Amino acid sequence: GCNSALLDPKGQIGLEQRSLILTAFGLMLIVVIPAILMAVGFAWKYRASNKDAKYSPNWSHSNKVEAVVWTVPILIIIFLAVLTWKTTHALEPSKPLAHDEKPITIEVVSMDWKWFFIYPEQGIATVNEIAFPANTPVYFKVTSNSVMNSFFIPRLGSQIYAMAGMQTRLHLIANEPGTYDGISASYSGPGFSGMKFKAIATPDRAAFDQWVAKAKQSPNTMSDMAAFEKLAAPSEYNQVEYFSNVKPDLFADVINKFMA
Amino acid sequence: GCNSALLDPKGQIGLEQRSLILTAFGLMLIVVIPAILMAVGFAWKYRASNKDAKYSPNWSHSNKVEAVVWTVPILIIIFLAVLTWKTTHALEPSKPLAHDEKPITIEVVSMDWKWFFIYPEQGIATVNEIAFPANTPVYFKVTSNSVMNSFFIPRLGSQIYAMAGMQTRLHLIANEPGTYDGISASYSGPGFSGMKFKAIATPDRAAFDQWVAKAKQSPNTMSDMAAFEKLAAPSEYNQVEYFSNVKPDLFADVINKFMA
Amino acid sequence: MFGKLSLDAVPFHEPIVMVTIAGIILGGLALVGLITYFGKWTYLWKEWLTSVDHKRLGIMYIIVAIVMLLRGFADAIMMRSQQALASAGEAGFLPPHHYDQIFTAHGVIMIFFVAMPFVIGLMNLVVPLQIGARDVAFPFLNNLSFWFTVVGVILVNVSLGVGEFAQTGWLAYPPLSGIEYSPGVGVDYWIWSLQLSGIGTTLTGINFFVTILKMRAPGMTMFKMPVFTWASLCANVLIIASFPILTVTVALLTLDRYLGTHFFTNDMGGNMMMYINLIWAWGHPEVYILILPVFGVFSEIAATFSRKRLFGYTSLVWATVCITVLSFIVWLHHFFTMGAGANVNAFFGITTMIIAIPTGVKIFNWLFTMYQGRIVFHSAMLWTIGFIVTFSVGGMTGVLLAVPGADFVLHNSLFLIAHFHNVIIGGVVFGCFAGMTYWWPKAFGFKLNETWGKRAFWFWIIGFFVAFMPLYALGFMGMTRRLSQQIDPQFHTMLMIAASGAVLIALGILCLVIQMYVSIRDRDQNRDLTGDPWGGRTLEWATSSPPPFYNFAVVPHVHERDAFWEMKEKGEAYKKPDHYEEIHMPKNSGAGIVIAAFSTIFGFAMIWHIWWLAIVGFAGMIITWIVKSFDEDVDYYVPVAEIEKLENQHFDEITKAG
Amino acid sequence: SVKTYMTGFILSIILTVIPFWMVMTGAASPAVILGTILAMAVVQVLVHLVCFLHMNTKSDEGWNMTAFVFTVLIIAILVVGSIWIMWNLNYNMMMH
Amino acid sequence: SVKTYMTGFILSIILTVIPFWMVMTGAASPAVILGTILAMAVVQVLVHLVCFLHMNTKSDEGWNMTAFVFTVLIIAILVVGSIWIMWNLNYNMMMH
Amino acid sequence: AGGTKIFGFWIYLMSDCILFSILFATYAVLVNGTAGGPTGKDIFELPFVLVETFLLLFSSITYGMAAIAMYKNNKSQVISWLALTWLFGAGFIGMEIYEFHHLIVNGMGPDRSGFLSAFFALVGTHGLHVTSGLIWMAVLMVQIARRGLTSTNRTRIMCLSLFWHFLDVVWICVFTVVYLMGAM
Amino acid sequence: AGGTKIFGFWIYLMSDCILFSILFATYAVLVNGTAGGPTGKDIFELPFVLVETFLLLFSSITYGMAAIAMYKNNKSQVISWLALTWLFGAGFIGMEIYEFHHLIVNGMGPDRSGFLSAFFALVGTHGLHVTSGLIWMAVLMVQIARRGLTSTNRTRIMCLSLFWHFLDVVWICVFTVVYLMGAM
Ligand code: HEO
Ligand code: HEM
Ligand SMILES: [Cu+2]
């Protein structure tokens, strides 16, 4: 798809990943296309029906042919492996982005069949929605309250796992303001289909502050583990929710629940 | 030698290096000693003169013997290679020492058949002598004004090369105050034997300040490249010299002489 | 007559060099006088000086190596005496200007013109005989290689006579050996000597590599060859894959010295470190070239004198192949103190440690070859036992030195010299003497005196221990290499002990000379009648003790590992063939010595900047090569009559002796 | 035959023309302009060896090829080793 | 024979007694007390295989040994791989 | 015929080597797993493990003597040596069961921590292996008593030799990695 | 007989491969060596290198046609093809000498910088190799004219074929690494 999520990304990491996919595709084509072409060519040209076709029922080894067969795959794998090493060392989710703007910290707790997000610096909490200004690095600290999940925003870039009692780091920056879809890429149970959220890349900071202020006006507060556990009850297709007051160290307590 | 320079060191780096030498010696003995013992044993016991000795003129292969022969060297090399990796990554001269006291920077320019030292922080210069307080890290920035040399203080620890237009880093700490000998470990020409200096590990800081003040009282000054070049004249068995006033960036100018 | 050459190029004032020159020139004049008096000029010219034959070129390599060993050991004695006198707070008798020349020349001679000539001599002597071939693939190439080695030797010796030698160590590190810091002509002597010797050695490597694979006796598969042939093949592979690195490195240094380029200069963006890397990229394979064949020799001896089949043939051949493969990825272990990253130092340390396993496997295979055999205490067997005992300690110290932590204080210290001298004396020269005494009957037809041989071996081993064990302690005490004047008195005692060791080794060398003399004197009583003196396993012992210029009248058929042992066991060892056939052989060629003389002139002119003479020499070389490329009468046919006569004489000797 | 030599000649013309034209015009990113020319060079290296190069006996078809393969491994050791060692040795002597 | 079994038994007694006595008394540095017991264990592993173990035919002396060698390489892959991967995966999830 | 069966059992033992290596890796990862519970140093009694090791080694030596006696074509000697080997194995299993019972009763069972679970898994797997060997010895002895030393019986004795010596090697690795290294 | 000589020359070419690889490594290290001097981009004329490459490729093809003609047992055809190959080689050497003369006269010789020294070394080594090939062609042609197509002559032609094609491969590597990559 020309207008696909991965082939038309909006995040930087998405852009380098798309470039890498296209370069890899190009490198593999140079060997794959001849294989299929020669398959069809040798099937048609050298059929039993043809009389003019050269018949060689004792030509069973060729040093030239074997050398050509071995060499080209080796060279293609060498080039693509050098590219793989460079990109893998340059696209590690556990690596801070190089940008002037200070990164915004978001904590992602993965409850059963819903998504929970905490802004500790802003001191707010959300369910099935996030917001961050465009052209600003975003630092995700992702953990699971329960069964393994996978935090993923296809348009922005790379995914990661959420596991109980383990913090995993991720970095994402949005080049174009707008609304992007976010899903879970690891089957967590019956309500796994339910896990869906929206990432709002605001055109400017002021819109982000307005969204934070709107979240601050929520009557609901997340100040104690009892309220967290009450929210953590098994539920399906949870609507977008807001919480004004957040415990200073909630992510730490969620991880320490499993003593890790 | 029990009272040898390397087997009775005074520096820390010397101590870990001696420990490593002894551990390696021990590991290699377990295989080497049996080789020589079996050589002498099989030479004596199975000589042509003996009649009771078992004669096997067709026993030419043994799976058990071959397995034993291959295995033990492999295991010894595996253990000593793990030790080698750990020590090599832990004894790199280009690595700052872990200690409370701030390291003292010494610049080591290697003139033809003599040693030159600069204290930039103290702003003094010396020929064929250094001083530093005991139990204090010392950071050597070593270069050669001419032909390759090798900065080396056997008792303190590791050596390094001095090459034209290249700065090389080294770290040394002295556990016991006293006078230690320092030589060149790379043949630089006829006057190579001449290259000899003394490292004075003072019992306390106050003695080091007294030595620095004594060096400050030298009538001679090293303020320009002309004076440096005048000193850099080919000379042999140069006596200990002092220089009060030093150009702020002399080491930089010495390296930039070769445009590197 | 032109260039830097003048009356001031010869050192009139210095007495030591003048008395050395007088000794050499009177020796040469006496030898020429004796040859003229006996009138053997013609015999040497047609049978020795210009012989394609492999055995003659092998014996002549042995002669060159032996005569150069005397000069090398004289330099060793002079250095040890100078160090001993300097330690006692005396000025000594060798100025640094002479000491530097002496140690550089000693290193170069003892590496390039003592070890390699002797080893390649042994290869030329036995490898063609063992594989069951009549000659080598390229006989004229072998003759040319010999003469190129002789040219290198001549240039090194004449360096003493006129001008000076290099004062930059035996490898000539760039910044000291540059035109800025070494204005002398010594480095040019070093350059051209090593260049021509390297060309010769590369040609030798190619020749042997082709000979071993292509000219094997029919029915002898790769895994049925004697172990020495395997070791020789591995060494020649190393020569082919290594010596180009030396050629290119020396060519780059001589370009820097002549055309004023900036390859290794400290200024104008030259990278000096590069040279060191390149030379050591060549440096470390070289030592295995010295140690692989001698291993084979010991294996052969271990087979012959234990009176039982060699243990772990497959293990030995796989171990030598592993050594050959691993000897290209370990060179950086020479300069851990250069200041490379922890990763690179650790990796190169580990890979240098890995190559220890195959050598240990080979030593254990020899030990288990001696396990339940009947061991005869011959000279060769004593050399083998001494080699095992010494080389174990050498290898121990080596693997200790291979750790970067230990190398950070033991590098360029007398511990390193103790290591390399220990392993060289343990393996190379021990295998050299063992092979010389083991293959002497196949070269001349008589045996060596056993008493003098045993005396020489005992003197060598005891002297080596006494001379080099104190160097371990001195290395530990922090005394570095190449010290000449005002040596720290604390190093006196050990050095004095080393001096004692030196004179002990001297007696050994003297013993060796005496041995050869008496072996020549009493040849009529110690003749090898049967052609099988020690009951050797390999095909080489099937022939008469003087082998005919054709190795075999009929090329032998091989079915098993030890061909000659199986032939003796089956009871068909000396059977008269039904009929003999005309044998195709190569003619003796005189162009090798002409090309050698032209190369000597070219090299000498290049050293002394005589441009026209160098052009004349190079043109002479190319013209001689082109002219010899024209003639087609290079081979002849040995008739049935001569072959039948020699075979009948040999069989009569067998019958009378048997 | 003449056919294989002509085929090699045509492939050599193509694999020489394309890199030259690509470099002189800057028709792509420098990374691509490096990777593709190296690929075409090694293919073009193989092209000359596959077509123009021909052995007479063909007798050691196993052997001659084994010699060629070994000659490569040594080059891949020496060149890569030298480049890596000098990169590290130059990075560790910069005025920092 | 009985001789090889008795020799194996004696070597096994020594290579079991020494590590136990060394650990219970803390007679050295912990690094040495680990390295030496691992060395003695693998030697002692080899001891039991060299002496007690015997294959009746001895027919595939090349083969059965090749099977044993391969069974090791796979273990050296799996165990070392698992330990390394889990070390990295535990270092990357610590609260830092 | 015996050759193929012995080679097959050898390949099964190599499969079992892989099986035990996986448990070793699992234990190595979960060695520090225990949280607010007993550690290696707190529960491992070294004398008990030393007695276990010596009795299993005595079992191996006695079975070796049984194999030698079978090569000597004697029935009574093989029966006696097999009985002594089975007695040593029964003693070893008894001590292992006693240790497990003591751990479980004291509230230190496999449900307490990751470390205890991994320890129980590895030592338990070895225990079931040894008890399978003991049942095999029982059936082999009752077969020998009523059939004599036949080709099938010789093949079974060789297979059980390979199995028992393999178990002793695995126990050497177990006490080196789990017991001795833990108590360090 | 011819087989051994051809195999020997092949091993010599492998030695020469090592020889050229060392020069390639030296050039790669000293590619940025130049200080206050001309760089790759400043002096490398790509059309000149393209003309050099095409003329050396024409030399290789003509020599190949000479080898085919020798297989066809014709003397005149081999002489004509060898003459055309030698003419192409002479043209290539002429252009290389002209380039070196232009560089030296303009004060950009091998004594100016490390980069220029390495460039001169590599291209010069290739030049001496090609001129050695040209002298070999001259002696081989004058031998053919007076001796005819003998076994020795056929062996020499095969050896020179291996040498010339090897030189063309080395030149491909040279223009890829030095000229084309430098001017990028
Ligand atoms: C015969 C000559 C020769 C040979 C074959 C060797 C081979 C070896 N060299 Fe010695 N070298 C030799 C002569 C020199 N080496 C040198 C350089 C040199 C250096 C670098 C110098 C430095 O760091 O300053 C090291 C570390 C060693 C160690 C070894 C090792 C480990 C081997 C190994 O490849 C072989 C060692 C043998 C062993 C290991 C057998 C003993 C083992 C047994 C019985 C099994 C026991 C099991 C174990 C130890 C695991 N060599 C130099 C350069 C000097 C200069 O700088 O100018 C020379 C001349
Ligand atoms: C026969 C007894 C030998 C003695 C007594 C001897 C003695 C010495 C001595 C004293 C040095 C100088 C070490 C120093 O710098 O203090 C030296 C250097 C050297 N020797 Fe020997 N040597 C002997 C044999 C050999 C042999 C057979 C070889 C080579 C195969 C050899 C190769 C060298 C080398 C390469 C050097 C280093 C030269 C340098 O530093 O530039 N030696 N030898
Ligand atoms: Cu080395």
Short mmCIF file of N, CA and C in Angstrom, two decimals, chain C residues 31-123:
data_model
loop_
_atom_site.label_atom_id
_atom_site.label_comp_id
_atom_site.label_asym_id
_atom_site.label_seq_id
_atom_site.Cartn_x
_atom_site.Cartn_y
_atom_site.Cartn_z
N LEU C 31 91.37 -20.74 0.84
CA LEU C 31 90.38 -21.67 0.22
C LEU C 31 90.60 -21.69 -1.30
N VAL C 32 90.75 -20.52 -1.92
CA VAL C 32 90.97 -20.38 -3.39
C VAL C 32 92.28 -21.08 -3.75
N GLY C 33 93.35 -20.85 -2.98
CA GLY C 33 94.67 -21.48 -3.16
C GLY C 33 94.58 -22.99 -3.11
N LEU C 34 93.89 -23.54 -2.10
CA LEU C 34 93.70 -25.00 -1.92
C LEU C 34 92.93 -25.57 -3.12
N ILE C 35 91.85 -24.91 -3.54
CA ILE C 35 91.00 -25.36 -4.69
C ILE C 35 91.87 -25.38 -5.96
N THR C 36 92.64 -24.32 -6.21
CA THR C 36 93.55 -24.20 -7.39
C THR C 36 94.59 -25.32 -7.34
N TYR C 37 95.21 -25.55 -6.18
CA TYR C 37 96.28 -26.56 -5.98
C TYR C 37 95.74 -27.96 -6.30
N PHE C 38 94.54 -28.29 -5.80
CA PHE C 38 93.89 -29.61 -6.03
C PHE C 38 93.26 -29.66 -7.43
N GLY C 39 93.07 -28.51 -8.08
CA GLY C 39 92.51 -28.40 -9.45
C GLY C 39 91.10 -28.96 -9.52
N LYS C 40 90.23 -28.57 -8.58
CA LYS C 40 88.82 -29.04 -8.51
C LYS C 40 87.87 -27.93 -8.96
N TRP C 41 88.38 -26.89 -9.64
CA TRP C 41 87.55 -25.78 -10.18
C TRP C 41 86.50 -26.33 -11.15
N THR C 42 86.92 -27.15 -12.11
CA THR C 42 86.04 -27.76 -13.14
C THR C 42 84.98 -28.63 -12.46
N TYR C 43 85.37 -29.50 -11.53
CA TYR C 43 84.45 -30.45 -10.86
C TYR C 43 83.34 -29.66 -10.16
N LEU C 44 83.71 -28.62 -9.40
CA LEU C 44 82.74 -27.78 -8.65
C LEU C 44 81.82 -27.09 -9.66
N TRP C 45 82.36 -26.59 -10.77
CA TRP C 45 81.58 -25.81 -11.77
C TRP C 45 80.48 -26.68 -12.39
N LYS C 46 80.78 -27.92 -12.78
CA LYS C 46 79.83 -28.76 -13.55
C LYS C 46 78.99 -29.64 -12.61
N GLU C 47 79.40 -29.84 -11.35
CA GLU C 47 78.72 -30.82 -10.45
C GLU C 47 78.13 -30.15 -9.21
N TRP C 48 78.62 -28.98 -8.78
CA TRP C 48 78.17 -28.33 -7.52
C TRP C 48 77.66 -26.90 -7.78
N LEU C 49 78.49 -26.02 -8.34
CA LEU C 49 78.16 -24.58 -8.54
C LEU C 49 76.90 -24.44 -9.42
N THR C 50 76.75 -25.28 -10.45
CA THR C 50 75.64 -25.16 -11.43
C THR C 50 74.92 -26.50 -11.54
N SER C 51 74.28 -26.96 -10.46
CA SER C 51 73.55 -28.25 -10.42
C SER C 51 72.07 -27.99 -10.14
N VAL C 52 71.20 -28.39 -11.06
CA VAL C 52 69.73 -28.40 -10.84
C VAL C 52 69.40 -29.36 -9.70
N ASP C 53 70.15 -30.46 -9.57
CA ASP C 53 69.95 -31.53 -8.55
C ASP C 53 69.58 -30.91 -7.20
N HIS C 54 68.57 -31.48 -6.53
CA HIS C 54 68.03 -31.00 -5.23
C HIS C 54 69.00 -31.31 -4.09
N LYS C 55 69.64 -32.48 -4.10
CA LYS C 55 70.54 -32.94 -3.00
C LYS C 55 71.73 -31.99 -2.87
N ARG C 56 72.35 -31.63 -4.00
CA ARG C 56 73.54 -30.74 -4.05
C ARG C 56 73.14 -29.37 -3.49
N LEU C 57 72.00 -28.81 -3.93
CA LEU C 57 71.53 -27.47 -3.49
C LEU C 57 71.22 -27.50 -1.99
N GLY C 58 70.65 -28.60 -1.49
CA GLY C 58 70.41 -28.83 -0.05
C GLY C 58 71.71 -28.80 0.75
N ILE C 59 72.71 -29.56 0.30
CA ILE C 59 74.05 -29.65 0.96
C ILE C 59 74.69 -28.25 0.95
N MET C 60 74.51 -27.49 -0.13
CA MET C 60 75.13 -26.15 -0.30
C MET C 60 74.42 -25.13 0.61
N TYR C 61 73.10 -25.25 0.79
CA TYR C 61 72.33 -24.50 1.83
C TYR C 61 72.90 -24.81 3.22
N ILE C 62 73.16 -26.09 3.51
CA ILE C 62 73.70 -26.53 4.83
C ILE C 62 75.07 -25.87 5.03
N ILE C 63 75.92 -25.87 4.00
CA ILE C 63 77.29 -25.27 4.04
C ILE C 63 77.16 -23.78 4.35
N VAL C 64 76.30 -23.06 3.62
CA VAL C 64 76.10 -21.59 3.76
C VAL C 64 75.63 -21.30 5.19
N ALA C 65 74.63 -22.04 5.68
CA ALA C 65 74.05 -21.87 7.03
C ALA C 65 75.13 -22.08 8.09
N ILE C 66 75.94 -23.14 7.96
CA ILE C 66 77.02 -23.49 8.94
C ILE C 66 78.05 -22.35 8.96
N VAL C 67 78.50 -21.87 7.80
CA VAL C 67 79.58 -20.84 7.73
C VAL C 67 79.05 -19.51 8.26
N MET C 68 77.75 -19.21 8.07
CA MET C 68 77.14 -17.96 8.58
C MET C 68 76.88 -18.07 10.09
N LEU C 69 76.66 -19.28 10.62
CA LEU C 69 76.46 -19.53 12.08
C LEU C 69 77.70 -19.04 12.84
N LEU C 70 78.90 -19.24 12.29
CA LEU C 70 80.19 -18.84 12.92
C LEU C 70 80.19 -17.32 13.12
N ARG C 71 79.84 -16.56 12.07
CA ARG C 71 79.81 -15.07 12.10
C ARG C 71 78.74 -14.61 13.10
N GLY C 72 77.55 -15.21 13.06
CA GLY C 72 76.44 -14.91 13.99
C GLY C 72 76.87 -15.09 15.43
N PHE C 73 77.50 -16.23 15.73
CA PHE C 73 77.91 -16.60 17.11
C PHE C 73 79.08 -15.71 17.56
N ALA C 74 79.96 -15.30 16.64
CA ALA C 74 81.06 -14.35 16.92
C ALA C 74 80.45 -13.01 17.37
N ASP C 75 79.42 -12.53 16.67
CA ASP C 75 78.67 -11.30 17.04
C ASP C 75 78.03 -11.49 18.42
N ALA C 76 77.45 -12.67 18.68
CA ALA C 76 76.81 -13.00 19.98
C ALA C 76 77.85 -12.91 21.11
N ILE C 77 79.03 -13.52 20.91
CA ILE C 77 80.16 -13.51 21.90
C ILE C 77 80.57 -12.05 22.16
N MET C 78 80.75 -11.26 21.10
CA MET C 78 81.20 -9.85 21.20
C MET C 78 80.19 -9.04 22.02
N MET C 79 78.89 -9.20 21.74
CA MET C 79 77.81 -8.49 22.47
C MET C 79 77.83 -8.89 23.94
N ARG C 80 77.93 -10.19 24.23
CA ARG C 80 77.87 -10.72 25.61
C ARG C 80 79.07 -10.18 26.40
N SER C 81 80.27 -10.19 25.80
CA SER C 81 81.52 -9.66 26.39
C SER C 81 81.37 -8.17 26.68
N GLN C 82 80.82 -7.40 25.73
CA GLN C 82 80.61 -5.94 25.87
C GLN C 82 79.66 -5.69 27.05
N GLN C 83 78.55 -6.43 27.13
CA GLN C 83 77.54 -6.28 28.22
C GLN C 83 78.20 -6.61 29.57
N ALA C 84 78.98 -7.69 29.64
CA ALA C 84 79.66 -8.14 30.88
C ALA C 84 80.63 -7.05 31.36
N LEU C 85 81.42 -6.47 30.44
CA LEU C 85 82.41 -5.41 30.79
C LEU C 85 81.68 -4.12 31.19
N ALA C 86 80.60 -3.75 30.49
CA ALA C 86 79.83 -2.51 30.76
C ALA C 86 79.13 -2.60 32.13
N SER C 87 78.72 -3.80 32.54
CA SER C 87 78.02 -4.04 33.84
C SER C 87 78.96 -3.74 35.02
N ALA C 88 80.27 -3.93 34.85
CA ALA C 88 81.29 -3.75 35.91
C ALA C 88 81.73 -2.28 36.00
N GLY C 89 80.94 -1.34 35.46
CA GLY C 89 81.23 0.11 35.47
C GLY C 89 82.44 0.47 34.62
N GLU C 90 82.72 -0.30 33.57
CA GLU C 90 83.84 -0.04 32.62
C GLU C 90 83.27 0.49 31.30
N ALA C 91 84.05 1.30 30.59
CA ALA C 91 83.71 1.87 29.26
C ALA C 91 83.55 0.75 28.22
N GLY C 92 84.20 -0.40 28.43
CA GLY C 92 84.15 -1.55 27.51
C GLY C 92 85.01 -1.29 26.27
N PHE C 93 84.84 -2.12 25.24
CA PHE C 93 85.66 -2.07 23.99
C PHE C 93 84.78 -1.87 22.75
N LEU C 94 83.45 -1.83 22.90
CA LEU C 94 82.51 -1.64 21.76
C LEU C 94 81.73 -0.34 21.96
N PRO C 95 82.06 0.74 21.21
CA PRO C 95 81.22 1.94 21.18
C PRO C 95 79.81 1.62 20.67
N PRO C 96 78.78 2.39 21.08
CA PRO C 96 77.41 2.19 20.59
C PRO C 96 77.32 2.14 19.06
N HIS C 97 78.08 3.00 18.38
CA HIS C 97 78.18 3.06 16.89
C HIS C 97 78.49 1.67 16.32
N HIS C 98 79.27 0.84 17.02
CA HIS C 98 79.64 -0.53 16.59
C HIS C 98 78.67 -1.57 17.16
N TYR C 99 78.23 -1.40 18.41
CA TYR C 99 77.32 -2.36 19.11
C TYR C 99 76.00 -2.46 18.34
N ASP C 100 75.47 -1.33 17.86
CA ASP C 100 74.18 -1.26 17.13
C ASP C 100 74.31 -2.04 15.82
N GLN C 101 75.37 -1.76 15.05
CA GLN C 101 75.73 -2.51 13.81
C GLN C 101 75.77 -4.00 14.13
N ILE C 102 76.46 -4.37 15.21
CA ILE C 102 76.74 -5.80 15.57
C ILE C 102 75.41 -6.52 15.84
N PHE C 103 74.53 -5.97 16.68
CA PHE C 103 73.29 -6.68 17.10
C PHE C 103 72.33 -6.73 15.90
N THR C 104 72.23 -5.67 15.10
CA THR C 104 71.36 -5.63 13.89
C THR C 104 71.84 -6.72 12.91
N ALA C 105 73.14 -6.74 12.60
CA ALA C 105 73.75 -7.70 11.65
C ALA C 105 73.56 -9.13 12.18
N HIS C 106 73.76 -9.33 13.48
CA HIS C 106 73.62 -10.65 14.15
C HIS C 106 72.19 -11.17 13.96
N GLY C 107 71.19 -10.33 14.28
CA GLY C 107 69.77 -10.67 14.13
C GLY C 107 69.44 -11.07 12.71
N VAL C 108 69.83 -10.22 11.75
CA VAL C 108 69.54 -10.40 10.30
C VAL C 108 70.18 -11.71 9.83
N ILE C 109 71.46 -11.93 10.14
CA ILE C 109 72.22 -13.13 9.69
C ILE C 109 71.56 -14.38 10.29
N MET C 110 71.32 -14.38 11.60
CA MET C 110 70.87 -15.60 12.33
C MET C 110 69.42 -15.94 11.97
N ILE C 111 68.61 -14.96 11.54
CA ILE C 111 67.20 -15.22 11.10
C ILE C 111 67.18 -15.61 9.62
N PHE C 112 67.78 -14.80 8.73
CA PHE C 112 67.60 -14.93 7.26
C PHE C 112 68.63 -15.88 6.64
N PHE C 113 69.83 -16.00 7.22
CA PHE C 113 70.98 -16.67 6.55
C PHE C 113 71.57 -17.80 7.41
N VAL C 114 70.90 -18.23 8.49
CA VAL C 114 71.34 -19.39 9.31
C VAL C 114 70.20 -20.40 9.42
N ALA C 115 69.01 -19.96 9.83
CA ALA C 115 67.83 -20.83 10.09
C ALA C 115 67.20 -21.26 8.76
N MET C 116 66.78 -20.29 7.93
CA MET C 116 66.05 -20.55 6.66
C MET C 116 66.92 -21.34 5.69
N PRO C 117 68.20 -20.97 5.44
CA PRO C 117 69.05 -21.78 4.55
C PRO C 117 69.15 -23.24 5.01
N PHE C 118 69.35 -23.49 6.30
CA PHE C 118 69.51 -24.86 6.85
C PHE C 118 68.20 -25.64 6.66
N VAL C 119 67.07 -25.04 7.01
CA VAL C 119 65.72 -25.68 6.94
C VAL C 119 65.42 -26.02 5.47
N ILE C 120 65.63 -25.07 4.56
CA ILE C 120 65.34 -25.25 3.10
C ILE C 120 66.35 -26.26 2.53
N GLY C 121 67.58 -26.28 3.04
CA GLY C 121 68.58 -27.33 2.73
C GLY C 121 68.04 -28.72 3.03
N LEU C 122 67.49 -28.90 4.24
CA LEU C 122 66.90 -30.19 4.67
C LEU C 122 65.73 -30.54 3.74
N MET C 123 64.88 -29.57 3.40
CA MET C 123 63.72 -29.78 2.48
C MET C 123 64.24 -30.28 1.13
#
